Amino acid sequence: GERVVINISGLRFETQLKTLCQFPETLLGDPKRRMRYFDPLRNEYFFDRNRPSFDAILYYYQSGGRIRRPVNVPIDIFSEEIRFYQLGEEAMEKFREDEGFLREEERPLPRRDFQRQVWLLFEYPESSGPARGIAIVSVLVILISIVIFCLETLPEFRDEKDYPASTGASSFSDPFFVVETLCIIWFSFELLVRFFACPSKATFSRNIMNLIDIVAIIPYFITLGTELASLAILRVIRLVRVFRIFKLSRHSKGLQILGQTLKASMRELGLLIFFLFIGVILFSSAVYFAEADDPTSGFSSIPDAFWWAVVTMTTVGYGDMHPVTIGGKIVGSLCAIAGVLTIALPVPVIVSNFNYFYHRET
Amino acid sequence: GERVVINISGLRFETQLKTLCQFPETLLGDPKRRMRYFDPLRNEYFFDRNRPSFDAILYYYQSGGRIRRPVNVPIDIFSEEIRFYQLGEEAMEKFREDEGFLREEERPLPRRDFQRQVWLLFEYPESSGPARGIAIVSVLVILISIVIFCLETLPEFRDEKDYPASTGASSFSDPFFVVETLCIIWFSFELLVRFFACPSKATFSRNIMNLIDIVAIIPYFITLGTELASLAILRVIRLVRVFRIFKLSRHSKGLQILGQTLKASMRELGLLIFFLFIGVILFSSAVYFAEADDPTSGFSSIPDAFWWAVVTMTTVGYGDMHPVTIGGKIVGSLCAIAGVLTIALPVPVIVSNFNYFYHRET
Amino acid sequence: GERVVINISGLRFETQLKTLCQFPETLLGDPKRRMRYFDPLRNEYFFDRNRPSFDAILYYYQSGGRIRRPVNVPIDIFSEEIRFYQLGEEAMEKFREDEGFLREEERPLPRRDFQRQVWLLFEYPESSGPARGIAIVSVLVILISIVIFCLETLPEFRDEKDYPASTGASSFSDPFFVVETLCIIWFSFELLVRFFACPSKATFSRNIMNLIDIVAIIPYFITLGTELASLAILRVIRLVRVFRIFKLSRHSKGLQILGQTLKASMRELGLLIFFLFIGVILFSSAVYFAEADDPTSGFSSIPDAFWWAVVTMTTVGYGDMHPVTIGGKIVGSLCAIAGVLTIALPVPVIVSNFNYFYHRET
Amino acid sequence: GERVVINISGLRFETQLKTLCQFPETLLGDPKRRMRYFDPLRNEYFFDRNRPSFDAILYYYQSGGRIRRPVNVPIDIFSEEIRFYQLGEEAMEKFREDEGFLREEERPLPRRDFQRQVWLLFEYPESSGPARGIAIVSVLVILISIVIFCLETLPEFRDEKDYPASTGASSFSDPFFVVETLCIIWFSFELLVRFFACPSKATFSRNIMNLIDIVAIIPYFITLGTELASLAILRVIRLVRVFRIFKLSRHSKGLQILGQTLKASMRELGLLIFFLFIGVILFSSAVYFAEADDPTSGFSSIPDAFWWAVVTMTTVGYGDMHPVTIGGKIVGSLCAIAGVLTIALPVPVIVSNFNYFYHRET
Amino acid sequence: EVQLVESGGGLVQAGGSLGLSCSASGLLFSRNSAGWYRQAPGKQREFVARIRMGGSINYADTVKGRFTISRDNAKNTVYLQMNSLKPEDTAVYYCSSWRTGFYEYWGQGTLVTVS
Amino acid sequence: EVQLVESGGGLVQAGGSLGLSCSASGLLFSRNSAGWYRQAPGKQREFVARIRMGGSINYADTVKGRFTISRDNAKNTVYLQMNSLKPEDTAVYYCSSWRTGFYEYWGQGTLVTVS
Amino acid sequence: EVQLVESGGGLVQAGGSLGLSCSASGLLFSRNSAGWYRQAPGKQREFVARIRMGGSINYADTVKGRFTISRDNAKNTVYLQMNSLKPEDTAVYYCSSWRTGFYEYWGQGTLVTVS
Amino acid sequence: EVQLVESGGGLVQAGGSLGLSCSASGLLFSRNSAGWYRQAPGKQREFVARIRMGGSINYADTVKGRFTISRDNAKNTVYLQMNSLKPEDTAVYYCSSWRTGFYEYWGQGTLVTVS
Ligand SMILES: [K+]
Ligand SMILES: [K+]
Ligand SMILES: [K+]
């Protein structure tokens, strides 16, 4: 096997001709390209380039594909070096893959002339002037919907009707109803246009923010339908109307990062709740058995010290009651300490995941 | 001493023949194996391999055994390099030893035909279908045992018998007793089979989860025995029945990691409780002597401000009372600050130990 | 192109003559300076200097300006190396730029003889003896101004006038008024001298501490003017007098670092308040709908559980009330946990910014 | 200047003869020692040793003394390398100085035969059997002294004398007095022997634990003296008796590390208390001016919301009262958040100092 | 589980003066709206008074200025002070406390008939 | 350390009306079950009433509809209102408060005999 | 929204003894200063008493030693005990509670005239 | 700043029955020990009763079984119930409340002399 000597700035690197021909379309392998740098006087290919990098670009030839950056070569000087050597776009994506950088930007505009134009208007708000106008209008509509959900349940406005039941009306006299119907009109129109102008109708019931729009529309329609057509469903439907607060996540990049963080960390949250349940059983049992004898004590059950055990460990602190025996006080100081000890353990994993997803936007 | 020149990719490394013969069974030392790579034309052994690694593999020959990975060679490229050089399995375990990786997987199945088959059924739940069935049944039995311990001490069911004592019955009328006996039947059968089918009966009273099974069986037997055969033992025995919550650790890998973390960090927990005791004495004494003169104050002792001092420093906050003097308020703000200052100091050691034992499963 | 071989301690580095002449005023480029080190016997320029550094000083010549320190050469050995090679002050500032070190010390004393002398007296307190005297007097004046703002609103001194209104006086009988006027006299004189002796009068309404002085002077003048010349302005003006506490930041280097930290971290604080608002809506709605049926419960509105939701999540804990249903207790333990989970997420960014600005003084 | 070529394992390092003679007593400089390694055949000094290290040992010769370890050579391989090269103990201490390791072990036993023997008995408890006996006796005496300070101020024992004052006695009838005198007898004897057997009487009033012994002895003597020979001193002297809890630090290595941590971090604690004072003034003023109008509110002063502001920010939470206006609630949620934001900022510095002093024992 | 018991009834003559009381357990009145309802013989119940939680009192036209409804806010007690009773009053009375949208509770009844 | 003192006794004639009281200190009744027990001359004690903590009242057959047991839940006081006393009642009465499985406490006794 | 109602008035003869009361809702008196003011016919109001919050009582020269102002600090009630009333007292009285710099509230008036 | 005022005095005949009271402000009695002291004419004060905080009552030999000292623990009030008064009782009485080692406070005095 004949040998080839490449001299990158005085540093002689040597290899067998077979190794650099494994990849033939590359700069060193291609006979013609490499011929330019060759110097016939000393039989060596002189190049003037970074010394620490050309070591990694000979490993790629001798290892069938692996591309790993030395830890003392900065990213920019390496990216340029794969380019001069002509290792190919497959190679540079693998280098990006080894530095783990997200590479997905797939935006298939339909390109049917009108579907594409209105999709550009309604999806990407930075594109135009009316796109930012539509973003501002949608955020203000969501905000007044939240304000109607809370001011509706306030009692000061219902005092014309605060009367015993034994004595959503379409009478259009209640102002909360007509402003509520205007909000649901806007949500329905916006969702139907985002359905009919999308470039992928099969994938539309896959994105989670679309399923947030649907479950925000639903309960007003089923209460209108059953009203102009139950008592178990009504208390559930009145609390599925709180999900319009999560429909404010299409316009925020902080709520979307908290959704990624809470998805990618479910094992840690399960460990958090499991450790809490263990500690609550243990400490509530010990305070019940160390304070039951005293005639002036208040713990009357083991499933009655559970609230006291959760508030002392998390530190909110109120308690249903408070220990009055010397023994209850020793099991209450151990409970206070063990609480922060057992809830601070899985939290650094969660904040590290957030910090990663928070800087990956950059 | 004759000298040998080895050229790993243009980089000439030289050593005395004696150094590479110290270990004779290895690739460089064995005369025949090394003869293949030798090139007689220039009297050098040409190899095409990583440059940063072959430096560490010459230190092993010149240092009688030390094997340390350069910090700029990734783990995979090094592991492969010890293999090509043929340094032996003793060498690769030492490299694993220097990266500190747990190497113990000792599972001595007895191999007596039936003892081994049922041991595979009862110990390793992933092996079969009935093994996962047995795991699911054991977890559900433990859960209903906890539910009986708490609902038994509730008072709503005892209101047919809530009467003065002056007026565990085997009458089989109390439903809590018969479901309790079913749970202890299942625990006893499962423990006795894990005793008689184990491959090491001498080590069976060494594993901690086995001693958890025994101390979960014990108090029901001694109360049945003494009932059909004390008043000091009864209040202790009623609280040793809370250890069935720790018998749920054979089926969780988060409770086992918290047990390793709390074993390997006892000096830090001792420092935590010691610092708390110092601060409680100091601040309770200062608030007693800075508020005793006021006729409307409530601290009547130094061992009466102890609870106030523990709840203010940990931040639960309720207090037995609250300072009413200007001086009590200055010693109560210093107490609030010094509490978090003196309890946040030993905690990063504990969370670092948890994080280590938590990723070592991977 | 003729080639030049430079030997830094046995290590031969080679380059084309064109590359080292790109920068001609430098040591290697200047023919005469480099001629001293040249050895005609072997046609190489021998230097005795650090090996790891001379690699980076050849990249600067071959990369048109980039200067990056290898990660295994300590700062001091590199700073000296750019000096021996004579790369120029533009080069050494760029090296300081790449280690990101603040380089701004612009103090334009006016140099008009008297304006410069009194500016040195009043601005830089370390310069003299009377400068530290003036610093001590200003800090004591600010402190007694804060003491008058709080002891004025105390009620024990007003009990000669605690009478119904239906029955800032320049009568000079109220001692708080005359000591207040002395403090505002000192602030006005000090600000007017710092105006008339400054070397840049156009930039004087740009520094934030100057605008703190102005808005601390303002409300006493407008209340004196309108008194010897409203009922909406009076309650606002009485609270803009609290900004004299921020006028104590010219004499502290900890308040100035907290101002830099809170300026450079506004996106994180916005995320903190946004996450809090989301959680408050969600948990207050769930506790209102899970406790409204009980006839002895106290939540009468969704905008009535808002305070309970803020105090439980932050852990102050008092609550307006406390859950009394099993369902309110499950939504109150989840609220306690999710509070610390959602407020501990943006805080490490803020403490990292503080730690950076806190050590950059060194 | 003649040149010398040293070949450490194939790697040729070259220098001028003058540089390696700067230090003449060293291995390379000494002509005779270096002559052994010299090989006359190729005029080079062959050595077989680590390659990354010999680079740093040539910088020491060329830089007049600097010794810095390359970051990719482990500590042990370097320590050995300075030894083979014979750089001297001054050099190895400087290497230890650059890795910053404490080097002080100065124990000047007096060596006067008896003073030295009893000093070994009383100071270093690991030396003998009676030394550990004396350590155990001293710790038990300190513990019962703390128990007398707290049980003395309890009221259950004084109920034979709980009578109006108008109607430390040496009557020896009070058991607390005689056990207190036994404790002060033991402290006095132990301190006087540690005075008269010390090897440095001039430095004895410099060590802080000795001044702890003196201020623990003092108040019993001055109350006995003034009793058998004031009303302002008596309430101070009764609280200087709490320093016997700090006399337990000679026998603990955790209290001594907390003393080093709290000494080396006083600027951070000053910043903590300063930030707290700023926030307390700001938030107590804003809640007083946003709740004074309501006729059912309870804040009657700005120096009456100070306690509410400290407990809400630190999170103990009790408050003197709680906001009842919409405006008080907005200034109370901002107060709760800004509290943890402004007290979590200087704390990582303190825990890092503790972690450093805590592992430096190893 | 909850109960609304009331007293103070009987018969009265012209120009009388009387005070019915409503008490309950299983239901703090501090937290719920309440009122007194009467049912004349022959027609459906009409309202004597309403004290919506928060101290807002409203009365029907017939009892204006002759009737007062007060929640002592202590002892879970609501008391009505009727005055100068007239023969048109003759009726049977009832007590109640409810939360709009969730629950409604009644008393057993206690009558006052004016001669 | 704890004590249960009671009053209201004596003798009564046919169709009487009376009210014994039980008070204690060292024992909040807010937190413990309580009842009144009587002991006729010649047989063992029987129960007049029981108010298990939580407001669940049960009475024996003899005193049904003529007796009421109430805990004012204030002043640590339990009061029994006996009514239309009959000669079969003649007996000595006792008071108690206990937690099942932990403690039992009695009064000294106070008698009511019906003529 | 807030109200100050008062009673106890009328006419008295020489050497009388009487006690007016002031009660309010929408205003805890526990937290605010209060006093009783009278207005003789022909001149402006003078002060009978003042109890600044914190228990500091001061009276004018005319009523010294014959008058006491007390806040039961319960039931949001301030009571004045007038004694040995004299004919110079003849006047109309008023009640008040205020915070200096923020608000001032009055009663409707209730008179005591001495014969 | 603090005061101890007392009432209930006068003169009584043989076999009387009376009850002095001690009240204070600036001093919750819930938190401090208290007692009643008397001073016969001609010798120094002796003690009638002591209720050390925590409900431990002790009396001197002369008043045993004829006297009771109780802290209503409400209204900052301590009440003594004297019984069957005898002529040896003739004396002037005083009230007190103190913390051993810190403070001692007295009443003005109020006398009960037995005929
Ligand atoms: K807390
Ligand atoms: K708290
Ligand atoms: K609290």
Angle at D355 between CA D351 and CA D357, to 5 degrees: 115
- Rounded Cα distance, B246 and B256, in Å: 10
Q: Is residue C23 part of a domain?
A: yes
D91: CATH: 3.30.710.10
CB G29 within 8 A of CB G78: yes
DSSP A362: -
Closest C-alpha to A11, from D50, C51, C41, B5 = C51
Torsion angle of C-alpha atoms F80, F86, F87, F89, degrees rounded to 10: -30
* Three-state secondary structure call for residue D263: helix
Closest C-alpha to G11, from G87, G99, G70 = G87
Say whether both A196 and A221 belong to one domain: yes
* Helix ranges, chain A (H): 17-21, 31-37, 51-62, 75-85, 89-98, 115-123, 130-153, 175-196, 208-227, 233-237, 255-263, 266-289, 306-314, 326-343, 347-359
CB B353 within 8 A of CB B261: yes
Give chain E's domain count. Answer: 1
The shortest C-alpha distance from A114 to chain B (Å) reads 52
Question: How far from G40 is each of B355, D318, G78, G109, CA to CA, in Å?
Answer: 83, 50, 22, 12
Q: At what angle do helices C175-196 and C208-227 cross, to 10 degrees?
A: 130
Structure token pair of residue H30: 């819930």
- Rounded Cα distance, D285 and C149, in Å: 10
Say whether both C87 and C153 belong to one domain: no
Structure token pair of residue A296: 């002036």
Q: Kindly list the residues from chain D whose CB atom is less than 8 angstroms away from the CB atom of residue H49.
A: none
- Say which residue the tokens 């009285």 belong to: G93
- Rounded Cα distance, A224 and A229, in Å: 8
End-to-end CA distance of chain A: 49
Q: Do B303 and D151 touch (CB under 8 A)?
A: yes
Say whether both A214 and A270 belong to one domain: no
Tell me the residue range of the domain where G55 lies. 3-114
Q: Which helix (H) or strand (E) holds D61?
A: helix D51-62
- Rounded Cα distance, A74 and A99, in Å: 12
Q: At what angle do helices D347-359 and D266-289 cross, to 10 degrees?
A: 150
Nearest residue on chain A to B74, alpha-carbon basis: A68
Residue G106's DSSP bridge partners are G96
Concatenated DSSP letters of A9-24 = TTEEEEEEHHHHHSS-
Phi, psi values for residue B216, rounded to 5°: -85, -30
Say whether both A177 and A83 belong to one domain: no
CA F37 distance to own-chain centroid? 6
Question: How far from B253 is each of B250, B355, B360, CA to CA, in Å?
Answer: 8, 14, 12
Pairing of strands G77-83, G67-71: antiparallel
Interface subset of B 54-73, CB within 8 angstroms of A: 71-72
- Rounded Cα distance, A253 and D337, in Å: 22
- Rounded Cα distance, E61 and E59, in Å: 7
Q: Is the dihedral of CA A165, A171, A173, A178 positive or negative?
A: positive
Q: Is the dihedral of CA C318, C322, C328, C329 positive or negative?
A: positive
Task: Examine the fold and report which residue of C67, C98, C129 is the final residue of a domain before the chain moves on.
Answer: C98
Angle at H108 between CA H106 and CA H114, to 5 degrees: 110
Longest pairwise C-alpha distance within chain D:
111
**How many A from CA of D69 to the centre of ligand 2?**
51
Structure token pair of residue D125: 């408890």
Concatenated DSSP letters of H93-111 = EEEEEEETTTEEEE---EE
- Say which residue the tokens 């036209």 belong to: E61
- Sheet of E77-85: strands edge to edge? E3-7, E16-25, E77-85, E67-71
CA D105 distance to own-chain centroid? 17
Q: Is residue B10 part of a domain?
A: yes
- Rounded Cα distance, A248 and A134, in Å: 14
Residue F98's DSSP bridge partners are F33, F104
CB B20 within 8 A of CB B33: no
CA D170 distance to own-chain centroid? 41
**Residue D342: partners with Cβ closer than 8 Å, 6 or more residues away:** C258, D275, D276, D279, D313
Closest C-alpha to F79, from F67, F71, F90 = F71
* Three-state secondary structure call for residue A285: helix
Longest pairwise C-alpha distance within chain G:
41
Buried b (16+ CB within 10 A) or exposed e, D78-113: beebbeebebeeebeebbeeeeeeeeeeeeeeeeee
Test the F interface: residue of B159, B223, B238, B239 with most F CBs within 10 Å: B159
| CB atoms inside a 10 Å sphere around CB H18 | 15
Phi, psi values for residue G41, rounded to 5°: -70, 110
Say whether both B80 and B182 belong to one domain: no
* Three-state secondary structure call for residue A61: helix
Can chain E be said to touch chain D, i.e. do they have 3 or more Cβ pairs within 8 angstroms? no
Q: Is residue C106 part of a domain?
A: no
End-to-end CA distance of chain E: 37
- Rounded Cα distance, B209 and D292, in Å: 62
Closest C-alpha to D354, from B271, B353, B258 = B271
Interface contact D348, partner A, CB < 8 A: no
DSSP H65: T
Concatenated DSSP letters of E65-113 = TTEEEEE-SSTTEEEEEEEEE-GGG-EEEEEEEEETTTEEEE---EEEE
CB C93 within 8 A of CB C79: no
Give chain C's domain count. Answer: 3
- Rounded Cα distance, A150 and A168, in Å: 16
Say whether both C232 and C316 belong to one domain: no
Closest C-alpha to F97, from F26, F29, F17, F40 = F29
For the CA atoms of chain E, what is the radius of gyration? 14
| CB atoms inside a 10 Å sphere around CB F66 | 15
CB F80 within 8 A of CB F71: no
CB A285 within 8 A of CB A277: no
* Three-state secondary structure call for residue D11: strand
Say whether both A200 and A137 belong to one domain: yes
The shortest C-alpha distance from B100 to chain D (Å) reads 16
- Rounded Cα distance, G114 and G66, in Å: 14
Nearest residue on chain A to B150, alpha-carbon basis: A302
- Rounded Cα distance, C348 and A95, in Å: 30
Task: Examine the fold and report which residue of B251, B282, B311 is the final residue of a domain before the chain moves on.
Answer: B251
Structure token pair of residue A280: 């609550």
**How many A from CA of A122 to the centre of ligand 2?**
47
CB A275 within 8 A of CB A314: no
Q: Is residue B277 part of a domain?
A: yes
- Rounded Cα distance, A334 and A327, in Å: 11
Phi, psi values for residue G51, rounded to 5°: -115, 80
Nearest residue on chain C to A248, alpha-carbon basis: C278
**Residue A169: partners with Cβ closer than 8 Å, 6 or more residues away:** A177
**Residue F29: partners with Cβ closer than 8 Å, 6 or more residues away:** F71, F73, F76, F77, F78, F97
Q: Do C293 and E26 touch (CB under 8 A)?
A: no
- Say which residue the tokens 């649901």 belong to: A184
Q: Kindly list the residues from chain C whose CB atom is less than 8 angstroms away from the CB atom of residue B10.
A: none
Q: Which helix (H) or strand (E) holds B196?
A: helix B175-196
CB B317 within 8 A of CB C317: yes
Amino acid at D9: S
CB A267 within 8 A of CB B361: no
Chain B neighbours, 3+ Cβ pairs < 8 A: A, C, D, F, H
Angle at B143 between CA B138 and CA B145, to 5 degrees: 95
- Say which residue the tokens 């007190």 belong to: H96
CB F43 within 8 A of CB F36: no
Interface contact E96, partner C, CB < 8 A: no
CB F50 within 8 A of CB F94: no
Say whether both B219 and B126 belong to one domain: yes
* Three-state secondary structure call for residue G94: strand
**Residue C187: partners with Cβ closer than 8 Å, 6 or more residues away:** C141, C213, C216, C217
Interface contact F52, partner A, CB < 8 A: no
CA atoms within 13 A on the CB side of D100: 3
Say whether both B271 and B245 belong to one domain: no
G39: CATH: 2.60.40.10
**How many A from CA of C303 to the centre of ligand 2?**
23
- Rounded Cα distance, G53 and C176, in Å: 23
Torsion angle of C-alpha atoms B313, B314, B318, B319, degrees rounded to 10: -40
Say whether both A203 and A125 belong to one domain: yes
Closest C-alpha to C210, from C123, C124, C107, C130 = C123
DSSP A40: T
* Three-state secondary structure call for residue B24: coil
Tell me the residue range of the domain where A32 lies. 3-98
CB B209 within 8 A of CB B249: yes
Structure token pair of residue A77: 């000087």
Question: How far from B276 is each of A337, B334, D206, F89, CA to CA, in Å?
Answer: 10, 15, 29, 62
Of C159, C161, C166, the CB nearest to G56: C159
Way it was determined: cryo-EM
Closest C-alpha to D341, from C67, F15, C266 = C266
Query: Where chain F is broken, by preceding residue (C–N > 2.5 Å)?
Result: none
Q: Convert chain C into a string of H (helix), E (strand) and C (coil).
A: CCEEEEEECCEEEEEEHHHHHCCCCCCCCCHHHHHHHEECCCCEEEECCCHHHHHHHHHHHHCCCCCCCCCCCCHHHHHHHHHHHCCCHHHHHHHHHHCCCCCCCCCCCCCCCCHHHHHHHHHCCCCCCHHHHHHHHHHHHHHHHHHHHHHHHCCCCCCCCCCCCCCCCCCCCCHHHHHHHHHHHHHHHHHHHHHHCCCCCCCCCCCHHHHHHHHHHHHHHHHHHHHCCCCCHHHHHCCHHHHHHHHHCCCCCCHHHHHHHHHCCHHHHHHHHHHHHHHHHHHHHHHHHCCCCCCCCCCCCHHHCHHHHHHHHHCCCCCCCCCCCHHHHHHHHHHHHHHHHHHCCCHHHHHHHHHHHHHCCC
Task: Examine the fold and report which residue of A182, A217, A252 is the final residue of a domain before the chain moves on.
Answer: A252
D317: CATH: 1.10.287.70
Amino acid at F68: T
Say whether both C191 and C142 belong to one domain: yes
Q: Kindly list the residues from chain D whose CB atom is less than 8 angstroms away from the CB atom of residue C273.
A: 337
DSSP B303: G
* Three-state secondary structure call for residue F62: coil
- Rounded Cα distance, B319 and B305, in Å: 9
Torsion angle of C-alpha atoms A10, A13, A14, A19, degrees rounded to 10: -140
